[PDB]
Amino acid sequence: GFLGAAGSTMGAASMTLTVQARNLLSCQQHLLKLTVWGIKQLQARVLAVERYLRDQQLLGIWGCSGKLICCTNVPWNSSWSNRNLSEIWDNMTWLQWDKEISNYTQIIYGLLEESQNQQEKNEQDLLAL
Amino acid sequence: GFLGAAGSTMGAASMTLTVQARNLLSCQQHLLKLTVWGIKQLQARVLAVERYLRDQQLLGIWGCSGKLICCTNVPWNSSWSNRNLSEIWDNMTWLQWDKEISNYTQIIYGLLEESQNQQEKNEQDLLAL
Amino acid sequence: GFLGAAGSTMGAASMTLTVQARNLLSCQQHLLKLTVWGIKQLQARVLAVERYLRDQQLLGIWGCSGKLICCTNVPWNSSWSNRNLSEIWDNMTWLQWDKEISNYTQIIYGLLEESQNQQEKNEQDLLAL
Amino acid sequence: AENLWVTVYYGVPVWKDAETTLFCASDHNVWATHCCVPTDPNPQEIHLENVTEEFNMWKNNMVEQMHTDIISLWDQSLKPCVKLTPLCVTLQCTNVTNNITDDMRGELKNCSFNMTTELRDKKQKVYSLFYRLDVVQINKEYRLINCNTSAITQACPKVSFEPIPIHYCAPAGFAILKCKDKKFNGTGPCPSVSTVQCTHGIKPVVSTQLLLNGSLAEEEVMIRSENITNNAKNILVQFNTPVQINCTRPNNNTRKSIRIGPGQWFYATGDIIGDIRQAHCNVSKATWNETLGKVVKQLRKHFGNNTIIRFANSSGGDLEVTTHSFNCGGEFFYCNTSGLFNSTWISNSITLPCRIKQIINMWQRIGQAMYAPPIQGVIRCVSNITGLILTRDGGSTNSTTETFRPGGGDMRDNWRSELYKYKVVKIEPLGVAPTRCKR
Amino acid sequence: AENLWVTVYYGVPVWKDAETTLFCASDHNVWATHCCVPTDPNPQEIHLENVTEEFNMWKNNMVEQMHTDIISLWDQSLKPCVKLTPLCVTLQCTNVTNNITDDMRGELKNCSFNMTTELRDKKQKVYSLFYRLDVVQINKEYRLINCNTSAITQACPKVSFEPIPIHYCAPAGFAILKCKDKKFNGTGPCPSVSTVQCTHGIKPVVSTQLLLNGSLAEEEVMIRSENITNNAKNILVQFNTPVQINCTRPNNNTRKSIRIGPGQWFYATGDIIGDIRQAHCNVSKATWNETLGKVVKQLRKHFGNNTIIRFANSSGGDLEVTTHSFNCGGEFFYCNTSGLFNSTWISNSITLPCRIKQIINMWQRIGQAMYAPPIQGVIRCVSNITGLILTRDGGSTNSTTETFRPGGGDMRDNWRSELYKYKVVKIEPLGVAPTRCKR
Amino acid sequence: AENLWVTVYYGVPVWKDAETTLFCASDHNVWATHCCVPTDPNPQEIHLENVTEEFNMWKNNMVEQMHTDIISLWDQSLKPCVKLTPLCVTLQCTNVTNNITDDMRGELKNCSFNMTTELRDKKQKVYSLFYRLDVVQINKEYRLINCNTSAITQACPKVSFEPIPIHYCAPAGFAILKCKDKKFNGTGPCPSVSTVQCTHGIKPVVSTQLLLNGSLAEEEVMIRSENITNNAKNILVQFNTPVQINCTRPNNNTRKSIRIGPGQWFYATGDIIGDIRQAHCNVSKATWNETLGKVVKQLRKHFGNNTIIRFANSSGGDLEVTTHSFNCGGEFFYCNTSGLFNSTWISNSITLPCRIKQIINMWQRIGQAMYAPPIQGVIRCVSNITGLILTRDGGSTNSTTETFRPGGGDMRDNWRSELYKYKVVKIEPLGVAPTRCKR
Ligand SMILES: *[C@@H]1O[C@H](CO)[C@@H](O[C@@H]2O[C@H](CO)[C@@H](O[C@@H]3O[C@H](CO)[C@@H](O)[C@H](O)[C@@H]3O)[C@H](O)[C@H]2NC(C)=O)[C@H](O)[C@H]1NC(C)=O
Ligand SMILES: *[C@@H]1O[C@H](CO)[C@@H](O[C@@H]2O[C@H](CO)[C@@H](O[C@@H]3O[C@H](CO)[C@@H](O)[C@H](O)[C@@H]3O)[C@H](O)[C@H]2NC(C)=O)[C@H](O)[C@H]1NC(C)=O
Ligand SMILES: *[C@@H]1O[C@H](CO)[C@@H](O[C@@H]2O[C@H](CO)[C@@H](O[C@@H]3O[C@H](CO)[C@@H](O)[C@H](O)[C@@H]3O)[C@H](O)[C@H]2NC(C)=O)[C@H](O)[C@H]1NC(C)=O
Ligand SMILES: *[C@@H]1O[C@H](CO[C@@H]2O[C@@H](C)[C@@H](O)[C@@H](O)[C@@H]2O)[C@@H](O[C@@H]2O[C@H](CO)[C@@H](O)[C@H](O)[C@H]2NC(C)=O)[C@H](O)[C@H]1NC(C)=O
Ligand SMILES: *[C@@H]1O[C@H](CO[C@@H]2O[C@@H](C)[C@@H](O)[C@@H](O)[C@@H]2O)[C@@H](O[C@@H]2O[C@H](CO)[C@@H](O)[C@H](O)[C@H]2NC(C)=O)[C@H](O)[C@H]1NC(C)=O
Ligand SMILES: *[C@@H]1O[C@H](CO[C@@H]2O[C@@H](C)[C@@H](O)[C@@H](O)[C@@H]2O)[C@@H](O[C@@H]2O[C@H](CO)[C@@H](O)[C@H](O)[C@H]2NC(C)=O)[C@H](O)[C@H]1NC(C)=O
Ligand SMILES: *[C@@H]1O[C@H](CO)[C@@H](O[C@@H]2O[C@H](CO)[C@@H](O)[C@H](O)[C@H]2NC(C)=O)[C@H](O)[C@H]1NC(C)=O
Ligand SMILES: *[C@@H]1O[C@H](CO)[C@@H](O)[C@H](O)[C@H]1NC(C)=O
Ligand SMILES: *[C@@H]1O[C@H](CO)[C@@H](O)[C@H](O)[C@H]1NC(C)=O
Ligand SMILES: *[C@@H]1O[C@H](CO)[C@@H](O)[C@H](O)[C@H]1NC(C)=O
Ligand SMILES: *[C@@H]1O[C@H](CO)[C@@H](O)[C@H](O)[C@H]1NC(C)=O
Ligand SMILES: *[C@@H]1O[C@H](CO)[C@@H](O)[C@H](O)[C@H]1NC(C)=O
Ligand SMILES: *[C@@H]1O[C@H](CO)[C@@H](O)[C@H](O)[C@H]1NC(C)=O
């Protein structure tokens, strides 16, 4: 049921996040002798690992770690999508949503990084106090 | 002292979890020219990484991240092992315990995944409130 | 601006931790046929992943996960560096600091591991109570 | 005013088009080994409700991926076998006449030559039979056809190239999407998408003009093309019913093993046992002249209800273009298909002779040649014609009578029709959206 | 009622049996390079209190792993050296008679032949000596023995195959468990398990009949077998004391380098300097006829206090089966062991001649042959016999007198006795258990 | 008393010296392919304020890395091309006399020989021209120079070795630091460090004595050495202005393709069209005898204001040592540089003849030789002399007149001057420091 929520609304699809997450990480002499097919299988496996880790690093940096859903303190810009919530969570899929946001992806990621740096400094200072 | 706790009781063995955890992740021209032994060393290293990450992903999904010990909200089924605590934590090893549970491993993992999905939705809604 | 903070004081440099962190993780037939250069590119990529993960595992074990800055409960030994805070955070770089500490690195890491094991046991017992 | 904040989600069911390396998987054959990883016996096909996607069979990198891998595997399995360089000698040849039927006269040649023995300093006189296609006249002196162009090696007489259905499977982080609409024709949106782990089994069959052993459409004969209007492009036709074809090589052959070096054996064709006859294929007349009627009706859909449709013979060029290249039992046939395309259609047993060749340029490359060892006994093949590769010339805009001819192809085209319904995408699990929560 | 919840633990000291690739590690030899990664000088052996595990030496994949890697390394180090194909010519040979002792008469042959020079268009007459085992008669015409079967290459006269003790080490996530019980015999539980990073050093020694240079048991001579009862199986015997054996090849040899192509040199055996003598091995009579007494006592344990034990000679077959294959100094000896197994036991200096061979089929395969260049001067070897490979025939259930014979083996068997105490397992750090805590 | 605790930081801007594999990257040439990954068109060079680091050009592993990779690439691109083993035959040769200028007399030889055709059993008489450097006398019988030592292969007449500027780029977790001080001389602290993703483009030019096509210092001519005092070491001189050199091979050449096997072609040098002349290089007298004045002033800095500086000719040895090895257009020149180093300096058009060689030992190894196919027409090269490789003998401590001579080098030295400013380091993002916070 890996992409089963693909046609679901954004709201409904939030219930299958573990279905998609669990499928993003995962002969003998034939591939070892045919050292021209092995060094495809290793490339495929190394790439899957690198892609997985890049996503995990971004989540870690943004202050979202070990969770599938994280609230952040970066305010939503109506200029990135001037739609109300009933247009987004209902009657719209995640695939359509990505098309609506695409161009603002880097702005949002940069803001999330800055927010966490400020939050961590405040925690260190508050604990010392 | 990597497997030093192997004969210890389950309770006593809980004190060496970092001993085992630290050992689960970790010439020149000979292996580079002998492109039939290199593509064993790369396979060995890639596999060790993939195995490590699969365990970390499961811990993350279950709501247990960055910890060696996690309490969860899934109730224990006496049907998986009708034993009291004094039969489990004392006078029994982890190796024996795995034999007692084995068949119910997938049931437990599925329950842990479901519990976390419900917990995350509740957190998002509570924060919005 | 990857190493831009290199000459900054230790205090000032704490504001660029995400600049350095984001750069620590990251043809066709030429490398596939030239199965003597591919098995350099795979080695380079596998090593970068292994180094990244070893650092993440240590942070996880010490009780510091998903954060760039963590307070710990291990007291500072004046014997590792008998300097006051105004000698360390100001008028000193991280490169100079590493030279000052180097020999005591393993002592500190061992203490951090022990502290977390005690903290986790206490959490499990407190929750059961 | 709304006071919304960015909420980060991971595990979002969103994907983008991507090109990656698929890994193979089956259920002494080369595909016995290069497809070991077994498929799941019960593939997890998931229907996606309300998903519409754009597909394009002419830009499908899965077709390109198969092509690269079929060639790469081919040249690896034959890598360790004996070279036949020493056979490139002056031959003394005569005609085979002993009980040869009239139709085969001059087709086979009996050649004797001086070849070395296992010792560097000794020679032996040996002889073997060759088909005339592989022997070039230099009064009786002949050369093997590959001698002025390429190195010739002997196919390993142990390696099987019998087509095995193979499956392609996605690597972690990727998925293969299947188009399940009805009457999908090459390109455009397909409002019926299903997700699979692997493709169905596809046999790596190589042929020209006629498409063999594929899937039989579904409801009706379908005609697909990159362009249709541009006659420079090919038209692929997929049948909704097979036409059974029976092919044979009736001569009862034998073999002899000749030492050509220390541990190096050459396999020669020996005398034919009994009567020598012509290779041929049987197509049922009453199936072919009905199956084409369906093709014609579908062509009228694009070429006109009142036009004239004519099926003509192939054009000029070499055997690999003008004949039906058929690989069966381990031998290479070049069959004459003119008897299949000889009709004019308006609105209101067929025997195909074949030639056998032993020195084969398997892929259109320069510098290599494969020698196919002969098969002992006789061979008979039964296969399903599942489609056609056609080209068009004229009519339409000038003065009626579009002429269609069987054409050649790019190898890829024989797989293109099976990889037709599949697309490869990558999953991008991160995304953001506005919510009402704050930390 | 107990109100318990699932608690997840990571870092649990639990493991399961597993098969993986071990990486090698030592301290111009091939094992100088294929075992670079140094072992820790002080391996971290950890005793596991209260751990009992089942071991099985007959199903140990470490034995299979060594076998695959010894062969793979062997054929890689010799890959770039000159082929001797041009030597497979008709030879003119006579007997070596100049100062040859009577016992060696007819053993060596003096062969002359026509071989090319570095120029394609010129030849030279050269001669060399060969042992009769490698020369086959075709009145004086001879062929090298490998010419009708295999390609022959020259072992690189720079590559050393002197056994080097090597260690196997576990990859991350794996551990090697060692059985430290006393008197462990092949299979079953071992209530003494220790965890190691690497195995002890094992020398990759190749031999038949007698096991050389291994570990000397510990307390008593031990007899191990897959079955014992089934005489089709071998019996391995491990000694608790070495028997010293001294082997030599007394002829003082020389070498000549012959150009056989541009930059391609062949190493030929030249005239023997001084008297020509037979190769042989010395076993101390007073050590052997005592060591076997220990073997016999242990056999009675399984075959009967009142039975009769007889040690007989080897059976029929080729040299690789019937003789003691001994590789020493770089030369290959085939020694006659009948003088070691000639006795009947009841309840109440030995000289072994040897032959030398130069064309060696190193592994039981078809299509390759290795030429061993001769060693200049003379060679003498000192080694420890550490065990026996025996087979059994009859007695037991019929009428007394079990006959034991030295047998051949599968190569693996010579490593099987050292890899004997080790097992490979994988660690599975996750697990769950009931506790009283809730989030 | 201070009550401080250990605080863990990740992402600390700290690094240590390290040696890793750099991956290449450019913008039918071998470097067209082995440097595909494009560089960023606008490299992110970051100045590091207040950073001082120690550099050492004589211990720079980037120099060693380039050397290993240039050789490795070289021998891979030529791997699949035809061997010329069959050419190693006895040649019949005479002098080329038809319109040969006096200065070239005896330089070229006209050789005829018996070589095979594409058929194993047929021969052809062919002839070609060779330069005398590659032909060794055995009255007219000659051998190719490589026949008694090495295998000879034909460079692929399609593969280009024209130098391409290439860049080295750091792998993840690594960075390349650049020394941006002024007047940095080989070793020691550089109080100006900048971080880069990749190096500037460096052309893999191979030469002796004169350094070609590099960076022109910056402000003044600089002299660098590992030691200076120890005359056993080389002195590298980097110019702050180029000296333009124009080289040519004036003979109008043609080619013929000779079949030497099935699909195997040999490229022979045919008759010269028109007048035959000597190859040579032009150096402007008025630029050279000024550029050296700058070199001399800088030498006095280390050798004395009142000493005598003498530039002498090269010493003895083979062409690869005593001449200027120049690779241009695809042909190999050996130029006589004595006209450039003939002066005595005190305090107060140049024509260089060249020889052409076709059989080249590209790297100082034994067992391989490369045949360089001839270039049709004529060639002319324009290049920038950017520096010198000099050695020293005497003076200093004895009695005035230090003698400097052009010397040979280790290949590496020609890249050493461009990789000069770069160092590779690894980032170590974890660290700890005392703070006032507790959990
Ligand atoms: C092997 O069999 C073939 C088939 O019979 C032989 O080919 C025959 O070759 C002859 C001479 O080239 C042809 O005869 C000529 O025909 C032309 C036609 O106009 C005529 O003008 C000439 O005067 C002469 O008759 C003959 O037709 C041809 N056979 C066929 C069926 O075309 C071939 O020579 C045989 N090879 C041998 C015996 O080595
Ligand atoms: C090299 O030396 C060997 C060893 O001496 C020579 O072998 C000898 O070959 C002859 C002829 O084949 C054997 O003689 C025959 O013996 C049988 C035995 O019953 C007898 O019936 C025949 O009438 C004849 O005498 C001879 O015994 C054999 N030597 C030994 C020790 O067995 C070999 O011929 C020599 N090769 C040369 C000179 O090329
Ligand atoms: C190809 O041309 C070269 C160049 O002319 C020819 O070399 C010439 O070889 C002869 C005989 O070896 C040399 O003559 C001898 O010179 C010595 C000098 O002292 C003298 O003592 C002898 O009596 C005799 O004269 C001749 O000098 C030499 N040419 C040069 C310029 O040195 C070569 O023989 C020609 N090869 C042919 C025609 O195959
Ligand atoms: C060449 O053919 C003859 C005749 O065979 C007949 O015609 C053939 C086309 C086919 O129909 C056969 O079955 C026919 O019998 C072969 O000679 C015959 O061999 C059979 C074998 O038992 C024998 O009974 C017949 O009497 C033979 N007839 C004659 C006239 O000899 C002949 O052997 C064939 N040659 C070769 C090389 O196969
Ligand atoms: C063949 O042998 C003779 C005799 O040598 C003797 O017997 C040998 C088995 C061994 O025991 C030798 O040490 C004996 O001396 C060799 O001729 C002798 O060579 C030595 C060398 O200095 C000389 O002093 C003796 O006088 C020689 N004796 C005779 C009779 O010549 C002979 O050289 C040997 N041939 C070869 C090819 O080695
Ligand atoms: C050999 O040289 C003659 C003479 O050429 C002259 O001297 C040369 C060095 C160069 O300066 C040429 O340009 C000179 O013309 C060649 O014969 C001449 O060929 C040209 C071609 O059109 C012709 O016009 C002249 O009259 C010719 N002169 C004579 C005396 O024949 C001759 O072809 C050259 N040989 C070869 C093999 O090239
Ligand atoms: C192996 O079993 C023995 C007992 O069967 C364990 O020894 C006991 O350890 C407890 C620890 O406090 C002591 O109180 C007991 O007195 C010990 N018993 C004896 C007989 O000495 C031993 O620790 C076990 N090993 C492991 C690894 O748990
Ligand atoms: C083999 O060589 C001999 C040499 O004279 C020649 O006579 C004979 O015809 C050759 N045989 C063949 C079949 O070419
Ligand atoms: C092929 O052979 C089968 C055998 O029974 C036959 O039924 C079928 O009709 C044949 N096909 C053709 C095209 O004749
Ligand atoms: C070498 O060839 C010649 C050719 O006649 C022959 O006479 C001679 O005996 C051969 N030599 C050997 C040792 O075979
Ligand atoms: C082997 O040689 C040594 C040398 O001293 C000797 O002591 C030993 O007894 C010899 N071995 C045998 C079996 O004779
Ligand atoms: C080629 O071989 C023949 C054989 O006699 C010889 O006469 C001729 O001179 C050779 N040719 C060359 C150029 O070596
Ligand atoms: C090289 O050729 C150019 C062409 O114009 C010329 O200007 C320059 O001076 C020449 N160089 C030398 C060293 O003569």
mmCIF file of N, CA and C in Angstrom, chain A residues 1 3 7 17 20 27 30 37 40-41 51 62-63 68 70-74 76 85 89 94 97-98 116, chain D residues 4-12 16 33-34 36 46 48-49 69 72-73 427 432-434 437-439:
data_model
loop_
_atom_site.group_PDB
_atom_site.id
_atom_site.type_symbol
_atom_site.label_atom_id
_atom_site.label_comp_id
_atom_site.label_asym_id
_atom_site.label_seq_id
_atom_site.Cartn_x
_atom_site.Cartn_y
_atom_site.Cartn_z
ATOM 1 N N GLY A 1 0.848 -1.184 0.000
ATOM 2 C CA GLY A 1 0.000 0.000 0.000
ATOM 3 C C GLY A 1 0.876 1.223 0.000
ATOM 4 N N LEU A 3 2.083 3.516 -2.160
ATOM 5 C CA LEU A 3 1.636 4.838 -2.601
ATOM 6 C C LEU A 3 0.123 4.921 -2.545
ATOM 7 N N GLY A 7 -3.819 9.476 -4.084
ATOM 8 C CA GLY A 7 -4.966 10.265 -4.529
ATOM 9 C C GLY A 7 -5.772 10.847 -3.370
ATOM 10 N N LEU A 17 2.000 8.118 6.747
ATOM 11 C CA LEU A 17 3.387 8.542 6.680
ATOM 12 C C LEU A 17 4.370 7.396 6.988
ATOM 13 N N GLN A 20 4.918 5.060 3.809
ATOM 14 C CA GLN A 20 5.910 5.508 2.872
ATOM 15 C C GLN A 20 7.307 5.504 3.503
ATOM 16 N N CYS A 27 24.320 -12.555 -8.145
ATOM 17 C CA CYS A 27 24.212 -13.160 -6.826
ATOM 18 C C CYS A 27 25.455 -13.951 -6.526
ATOM 19 N N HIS A 30 28.014 -14.650 -9.304
ATOM 20 C CA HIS A 30 27.696 -14.008 -10.576
ATOM 21 C C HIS A 30 28.084 -12.538 -10.552
ATOM 22 N N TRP A 37 28.672 -5.666 -13.171
ATOM 23 C CA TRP A 37 27.276 -5.560 -12.691
ATOM 24 C C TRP A 37 27.309 -5.349 -11.193
ATOM 25 N N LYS A 40 27.210 -1.965 -10.235
ATOM 26 C CA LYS A 40 25.966 -1.236 -10.343
ATOM 27 C C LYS A 40 25.162 -1.448 -9.095
ATOM 28 N N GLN A 41 25.253 -2.652 -8.546
ATOM 29 C CA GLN A 41 24.485 -2.930 -7.355
ATOM 30 C C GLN A 41 25.030 -2.128 -6.192
ATOM 31 N N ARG A 51 20.634 9.204 -0.101
ATOM 32 C CA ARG A 51 19.418 9.993 -0.180
ATOM 33 C C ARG A 51 18.685 9.978 1.147
ATOM 34 N N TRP A 62 16.636 21.278 11.206
ATOM 35 C CA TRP A 62 15.449 22.091 11.418
ATOM 36 C C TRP A 62 14.842 21.938 12.813
ATOM 37 N N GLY A 63 15.359 21.017 13.629
ATOM 38 C CA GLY A 63 14.812 20.802 14.953
ATOM 39 C C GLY A 63 13.710 19.767 14.965
ATOM 40 N N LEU A 68 7.640 12.177 12.511
ATOM 41 C CA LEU A 68 7.157 12.317 11.149
ATOM 42 C C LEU A 68 6.450 13.653 10.953
ATOM 43 N N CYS A 70 6.317 17.662 12.443
ATOM 44 C CA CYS A 70 6.841 18.661 13.364
ATOM 45 C C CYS A 70 6.305 20.040 13.149
ATOM 46 N N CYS A 71 5.930 20.667 14.239
ATOM 47 C CA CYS A 71 5.491 22.037 14.182
ATOM 48 C C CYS A 71 6.758 22.850 14.255
ATOM 49 N N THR A 72 6.792 23.989 13.599
ATOM 50 C CA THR A 72 7.966 24.828 13.663
ATOM 51 C C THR A 72 7.483 26.208 13.966
ATOM 52 N N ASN A 73 8.398 27.125 14.235
ATOM 53 C CA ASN A 73 7.991 28.479 14.557
ATOM 54 C C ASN A 73 8.121 29.447 13.398
ATOM 55 N N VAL A 74 8.327 28.935 12.197
ATOM 56 C CA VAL A 74 8.413 29.813 11.051
ATOM 57 C C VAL A 74 7.000 30.086 10.578
ATOM 58 N N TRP A 76 3.819 31.091 8.257
ATOM 59 C CA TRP A 76 3.521 30.851 6.869
ATOM 60 C C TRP A 76 3.334 32.157 6.155
ATOM 61 N N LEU A 85 -7.062 27.178 4.805
ATOM 62 C CA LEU A 85 -6.803 25.786 5.158
ATOM 63 C C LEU A 85 -7.764 24.798 4.522
ATOM 64 N N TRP A 89 -5.989 21.287 3.033
ATOM 65 C CA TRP A 89 -6.040 19.995 3.675
ATOM 66 C C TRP A 89 -7.124 19.093 3.105
ATOM 67 N N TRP A 94 -1.170 15.753 -2.141
ATOM 68 C CA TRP A 94 0.193 16.215 -1.895
ATOM 69 C C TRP A 94 0.962 16.451 -3.172
ATOM 70 N N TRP A 97 -0.060 19.825 -4.296
ATOM 71 C CA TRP A 97 0.496 20.801 -3.397
ATOM 72 C C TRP A 97 1.939 21.062 -3.736
ATOM 73 N N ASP A 98 2.712 20.018 -4.019
ATOM 74 C CA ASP A 98 4.105 20.260 -4.329
ATOM 75 C C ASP A 98 4.220 21.203 -5.518
ATOM 76 N N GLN A 116 15.992 27.220 14.043
ATOM 77 C CA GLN A 116 16.587 26.309 14.998
ATOM 78 C C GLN A 116 17.860 26.866 15.589
ATOM 79 N N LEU D 4 -0.839 31.117 10.685
ATOM 80 C CA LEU D 4 -0.436 29.762 10.356
ATOM 81 C C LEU D 4 1.068 29.656 10.363
ATOM 82 N N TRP D 5 1.560 28.454 10.612
ATOM 83 C CA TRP D 5 2.989 28.153 10.655
ATOM 84 C C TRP D 5 3.352 26.986 9.775
ATOM 85 N N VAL D 6 4.605 26.947 9.372
ATOM 86 C CA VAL D 6 5.081 25.858 8.551
ATOM 87 C C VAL D 6 5.154 24.578 9.367
ATOM 88 N N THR D 7 4.519 23.516 8.882
ATOM 89 C CA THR D 7 4.595 22.211 9.531
ATOM 90 C C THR D 7 5.300 21.279 8.587
ATOM 91 N N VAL D 8 6.283 20.583 9.110
ATOM 92 C CA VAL D 8 7.084 19.690 8.314
ATOM 93 C C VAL D 8 6.557 18.288 8.377
ATOM 94 N N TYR D 9 6.383 17.672 7.217
ATOM 95 C CA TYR D 9 5.926 16.301 7.163
ATOM 96 C C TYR D 9 6.950 15.436 6.474
ATOM 97 N N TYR D 10 7.145 14.237 7.002
ATOM 98 C CA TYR D 10 8.016 13.269 6.372
ATOM 99 C C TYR D 10 7.268 11.989 6.145
ATOM 100 N N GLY D 11 7.335 11.489 4.923
ATOM 101 C CA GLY D 11 6.608 10.294 4.541
ATOM 102 C C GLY D 11 5.453 10.688 3.632
ATOM 103 N N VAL D 12 5.585 11.821 2.975
ATOM 104 C CA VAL D 12 4.576 12.319 2.074
ATOM 105 C C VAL D 12 4.548 11.501 0.781
ATOM 106 N N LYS D 16 8.426 12.227 -8.247
ATOM 107 C CA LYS D 16 8.862 12.902 -9.468
ATOM 108 C C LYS D 16 9.480 11.912 -10.437
ATOM 109 N N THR D 33 21.329 -16.526 -14.444
ATOM 110 C CA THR D 33 22.356 -16.074 -13.512
ATOM 111 C C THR D 33 22.179 -14.574 -13.397
ATOM 112 N N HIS D 34 21.999 -13.880 -14.518
ATOM 113 C CA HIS D 34 21.936 -12.398 -14.396
ATOM 114 C C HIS D 34 20.547 -11.954 -13.949
ATOM 115 N N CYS D 36 19.117 -13.548 -10.766
ATOM 116 C CA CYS D 36 18.931 -14.539 -9.682
ATOM 117 C C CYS D 36 17.903 -14.097 -8.647
ATOM 118 N N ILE D 46 -0.456 -2.296 -6.271
ATOM 119 C CA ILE D 46 -1.388 -1.421 -5.575
ATOM 120 C C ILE D 46 -2.100 -0.448 -6.486
ATOM 121 N N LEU D 48 -3.878 2.840 -7.528
ATOM 122 C CA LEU D 48 -3.925 4.158 -6.947
ATOM 123 C C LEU D 48 -5.209 4.853 -7.340
ATOM 124 N N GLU D 49 -6.058 5.115 -6.382
ATOM 125 C CA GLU D 49 -7.298 5.753 -6.754
ATOM 126 C C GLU D 49 -7.019 7.201 -7.101
ATOM 127 N N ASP D 69 21.858 -3.506 -21.224
ATOM 128 C CA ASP D 69 22.145 -4.717 -20.480
ATOM 129 C C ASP D 69 22.098 -5.991 -21.310
ATOM 130 N N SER D 72 25.490 -5.937 -22.941
ATOM 131 C CA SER D 72 26.540 -6.127 -21.973
ATOM 132 C C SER D 72 26.584 -7.558 -21.491
ATOM 133 N N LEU D 73 25.435 -8.171 -21.208
ATOM 134 C CA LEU D 73 25.467 -9.550 -20.760
ATOM 135 C C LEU D 73 25.970 -10.456 -21.864
ATOM 136 N N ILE D 427 10.673 8.720 -5.072
ATOM 137 C CA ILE D 427 9.874 9.273 -4.007
ATOM 138 C C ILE D 427 10.625 10.366 -3.278
ATOM 139 N N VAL D 432 6.194 20.484 3.102
ATOM 140 C CA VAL D 432 5.686 21.368 4.128
ATOM 141 C C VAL D 432 4.306 21.851 3.780
ATOM 142 N N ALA D 433 3.553 22.271 4.782
ATOM 143 C CA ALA D 433 2.235 22.854 4.562
ATOM 144 C C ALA D 433 1.845 23.704 5.768
ATOM 145 N N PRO D 434 0.994 24.731 5.637
ATOM 146 C CA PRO D 434 0.504 25.527 6.739
ATOM 147 C C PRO D 434 -0.449 24.790 7.646
ATOM 148 N N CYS D 437 -0.365 24.872 14.312
ATOM 149 C CA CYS D 437 0.436 24.591 15.501
ATOM 150 C C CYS D 437 1.760 25.338 15.515
ATOM 151 N N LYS D 438 2.195 25.685 16.720
ATOM 152 C CA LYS D 438 3.463 26.343 17.001
ATOM 153 C C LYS D 438 4.164 25.515 18.071
ATOM 154 N N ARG D 439 5.488 25.515 18.135
ATOM 155 C CA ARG D 439 6.120 24.702 19.164
ATOM 156 C C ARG D 439 5.763 25.195 20.559
#
